[PDB]
Amino acid sequence: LAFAFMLNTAIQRPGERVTAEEIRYMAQELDAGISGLYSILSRELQLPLVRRLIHILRRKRKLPDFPRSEVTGEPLIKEKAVTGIEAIGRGDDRNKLIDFITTANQALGPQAMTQFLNVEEALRRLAASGSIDTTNLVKTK
Amino acid sequence: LAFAFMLNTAIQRPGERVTAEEIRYMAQELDAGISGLYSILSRELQLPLVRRLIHILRRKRKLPDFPRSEVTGEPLIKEKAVTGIEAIGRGDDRNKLIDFITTANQALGPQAMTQFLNVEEALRRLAASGSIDTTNLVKTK
Amino acid sequence: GARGVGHMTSKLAVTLFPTNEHFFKLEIDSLAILASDQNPEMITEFDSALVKVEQAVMRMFETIGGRAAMH
Amino acid sequence: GARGVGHMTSKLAVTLFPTNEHFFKLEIDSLAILASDQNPEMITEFDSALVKVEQAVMRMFETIGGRAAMH
What we know:
This is part of a larger assembly, with four copies of chain A.
Chain A: H1 20-32, H2 35-59, E1 77-79, H3 85-88, H4 90-108, H5 125-128
């Protein structure tokens, strides 16, 4: 029953030590064992809730209307759902992007800085990413 | 039954420590155990689904039609299905290419950058690879 | 039964609605960008506006105390 | 049986449709490039077009919520 309800005592094995990789493996098993439930909840609860929230926000007039497609009429922006390992490892996605950039820099050096992968210039826009405005230190163009 | 259904519990061996290389070995065993199912699913589901998706997308007029071959008439761009270790190690393929470049640079040094293996110039194009556009930082030609 | 129900409820509530990462993504349709032949220079401003809208939606959600009701 | 079904289905879903890497690749037919005597200079623009189409297709796929149906 404890294995079925995904508690934490079942992983602990008396008798000897357990490696960190083993613990990660059992954690992967535990996260896997409920995949159907996270999927159905994501498809059922998250999307209609955010749609209703954005509709009420629009009707309150706190934000102007979304632009609509000229060809189809569909809204130009849609909505997603992130559950489980995806939410845990969006940071891993960022880490993979930065690791790709850094490995390219190691392979090529400062002579890399010319014509494939952007040096990505951190003062202005990623400051505006995650809210916050531009300028301040920015010596504007 | 646990070994057959490819759970993580039957993997652990009571009594003594297990090395990381051993764990990788038996993980390879588990990934090997259902290779036929991954192959048949890749042949049956992934490919017709993407073909139908792209046909719907084209019929929506959302993206212009694919070029066709003059000699044969087949589209100039085709598709491929990635499953399992291939998906896990596309990053490993990238790492192999970058490691080959780095090993060549180590072997040849500053004098490398002359006439065999390109220093791959990272500012412009890989900023347009994985989407996003060029320029911004790029002092245009 | 009690321990299992409590533990599963807490873990599901935490995972489904993470406190740090955004639990939804308002993503611009670059399909419409291609269809309209949109200038790629405006994508930065569009992303900025979208992130402001996302954080606005999340703060409004957090205002009405959705976490306890979800739990 | 229930645990085996759940675990196998979850791992199959997460492997067949990885969340990070694209599960399909649109490859420009280099055979056609050779046959038409295409200039290798334009292959950069062709790759840019291919990656744009690839991300557009993946976004449209994720819009209709294909993950839950696949699971």
